[PDB]
Amino acid sequence: MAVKKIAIFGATGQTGLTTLAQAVQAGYEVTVLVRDSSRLPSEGPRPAHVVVGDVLQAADVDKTVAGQDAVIVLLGTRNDLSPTTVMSEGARNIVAAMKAHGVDKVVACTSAFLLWDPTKVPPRLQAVTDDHIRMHKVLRESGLKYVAVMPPHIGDQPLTGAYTVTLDGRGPSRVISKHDLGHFMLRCLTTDEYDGHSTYPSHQYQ
Amino acid sequence: MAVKKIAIFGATGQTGLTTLAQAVQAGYEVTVLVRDSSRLPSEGPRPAHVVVGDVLQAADVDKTVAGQDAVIVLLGTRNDLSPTTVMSEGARNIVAAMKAHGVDKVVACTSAFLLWDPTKVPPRLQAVTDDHIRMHKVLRESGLKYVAVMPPHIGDQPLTGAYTVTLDGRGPSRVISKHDLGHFMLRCLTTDEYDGHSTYPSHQYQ
Ligand SMILES: NC(=O)c1ccc[n+]([C@@H]2O[C@H](COP(=O)([O-])OP(=O)(O)OC[C@H]3O[C@@H](n4cnc5c(N)ncnc54)[C@H](OP(=O)(O)O)[C@@H]3O)[C@@H](O)[C@H]2O)c1
Ligand SMILES: NC(=O)c1ccc[n+]([C@@H]2O[C@H](COP(=O)([O-])OP(=O)(O)OC[C@H]3O[C@@H](n4cnc5c(N)ncnc54)[C@H](OP(=O)(O)O)[C@@H]3O)[C@@H](O)[C@H]2O)c1
Ligand SMILES: O=C(O)c1ccc(-n2nc(-c3ccccc3O)nc2-c2ccccc2O)cc1
């Protein structure tokens, strides 16, 4: 087990940007798929490789997944309020490209709403949650080594690295810093302990 | 009056109605956004301008924020404890409209539960608190001059002007009257001392 090359999908998002920065600082050779390159910061840590394209475009995903050791998925659809399939269709393209290229490890973020009663989901988040569920099923039925990361509210607190991780359930805390969440996405690259499990990271930021 | 034209969101609510009355008495030129089925009472004080629409429509929020000096946010769900995103989505529309119209000052009410240990928030209030948390992050990340008003129980005791304002922590009493809360929302328009802080107003009525 030695992951050196990773693809990150969703690297321009709030969690993606800090996951990308941390990965670069730790020494990973990171490839990102971005739809427009000007949103990547021009100062600080930069990825080794940039593919310009869409997770909905199978060829763009293929170019991104080729030659990787593992994939991190931090896709989201920003403000869709009504039925949407971007994340699950992108997950299908990711799965197909990982198969074609022999990449066997994927760490993907959905939501802790998948661990709660469906009546906890606010009405205007039901569509996105539904597609998270579709994307989770896609990844679980793929047969790939899949770590399901299902975070509660994503905050802006500083990196601590001291969060809780609860397997196949929700945990006591109900927030995770975007920085701590990115930290855990990368921690999942260094072990098979979470493979096949759903994970809930959460921490105290008093 | 350096701040003269204000938008109030939630003016028909418990705290809104007395905030509106006090603003009009103090000489503010008040614009309100009201939902079509829920106008202001016929006998009560009259705002200068009424927009009929929904905080969930960007166009209605834009009409309400255009030309203002400052915004007060007293949105809420009345007695309804169901999951919701009306406050966080409304705040996103308010931020965008403020940025487009050159309005910097936003005084917005969430709840003192944002200062609690999360494991201690009553489960019955967790869904509403989750949207207050989402709303607070939207406003904190906006870069606007944002006063985060985080009250404890809102009661029916009198207007006093004599309440305690505790910065960035819980205060010494567990109640604030709706009239004192509205008085404090208006006070925040006339100083910069609470910008970028959380504020907990509270009082002992005797
Ligand atoms: N906000 C929360 O508290 C919370 C809580 C639990 C779970 N989640 C979920 O966790 C995940 C990460 O969320 P986040 O807030 O960090 O994400 P985010 O800031 O909304 O960014 C989403 C990422 O996905 C990219 N993206 C969207 N559509 C794409 C497409 N067709 N092709 C390629 N890339 C695309 C976006 O690229 P662009 O920059 O090009 O748009 C961006 O990089 C999301 O699925 C979210 O729903 C969020
Ligand atoms: N002890 C407490 O009650 C307590 C304690 C701490 C914090 N809080 C929080 O304090 C805040 C203010 O509470 P409150 O009791 O004064 O408020 P409220 O009586 O619940 O009034 C809510 C206001 O928001 C309006 N509103 C709701 N949805 C809207 C929409 N889609 N578009 C436009 N306007 C909308 C309502 O309009 P309609 O007239 O059309 O309904 C009403 O004017 C709330 O966020 C509450 O959660 C309450
Ligand atoms: O920091 C403190 O002391 C403190 C913090 C929060 C409260 N809130 N806010 C609420 C509340 C009610 C309706 C909508 C949103 C809300 O947030 N309900 C309570 C409440 C909590 C415990 C017992 C009685 C209550 O009325 C009171 C005090």
Cβ atoms of B11 and B40 closer than 8 Å: yes
CB atoms within 10 A of CB A84: 16
Residue A155 β-bridge partners:
A177
A123, B84: Cβ pair inside 8 Å? yes
Q: How far apart are CA A66 and CA A103, in angstroms?
A: 8
Respond yes or no: is residue B188 known to be catalytic. yes
- Decide if A127 touches B, using CB distance below 8 A: no
Residue to mutate, B109, B125, B181, ligand 3, most ligand atoms under 8 Å from C-beta: B125
Elucidation technique: X-ray
Burial A162-172 (b: 16+ CB within 10 A, else e): ebebbeeebbe
A71: helix, coil or strand?
Answer: strand
How many interchain CB pairs under 8 A, A with B? 31
For residue B115 and ligand 2, the question of a CB distance below 6 A is answered with no
Q: How many domains does chain A have?
A: 1
CA within 13 Å, CB half, A100:
14
Write out the DSSP string of A20-81.
HHHHHHHT-EEEEEES-GGGS-SSS---SEEEES-TTSHHHHHHHHTT-SEEEE----SS--
Give B-chain residues touching A119 at CB under 8 angstroms: 83
CB A132 within 8 A of CB A125: no
Alpha-carbon distance values, A33 to A148, B65, B142 (Å): 21, 38, 27
Q: Which residues of B touch A120 (CB under 8 A)?
A: 83, 127
Cα–Cα distance measured from residue A66 to residue A9, given in angstroms and rounded to the nearest whole number:
13
* B46 annotated to a ligand binding site: no
State the alpha helices, DSSP H only, in chain B: 14-25, 58-65, 86-101, 126-141, 178-187
SS3 A113: helix
A30, A44, A38, A48: which is closest to A12 by C-alpha? A38
d(CA A11, CA A34): 7
A109 in Cβ contact with A74 (< 8 Å): yes
* Residue ranges making up the domain that contains B161: 1-206
| Distance (Å, whole) CA B188 – CA B109 | 12
Resolution (A): 1.5
A198 three-state secondary structure = strand
CA distance to B8, B80, B107, B185, per residue, from B194 (Å)? 19, 30, 9, 11
Q: List chain B residues with CB under 8 Å of A166.
A: none
Q: Which of A84, A184, A170 is nearest to A132 (CA)?
A: A84
State yes or no: is B60 an active-site residue.
no
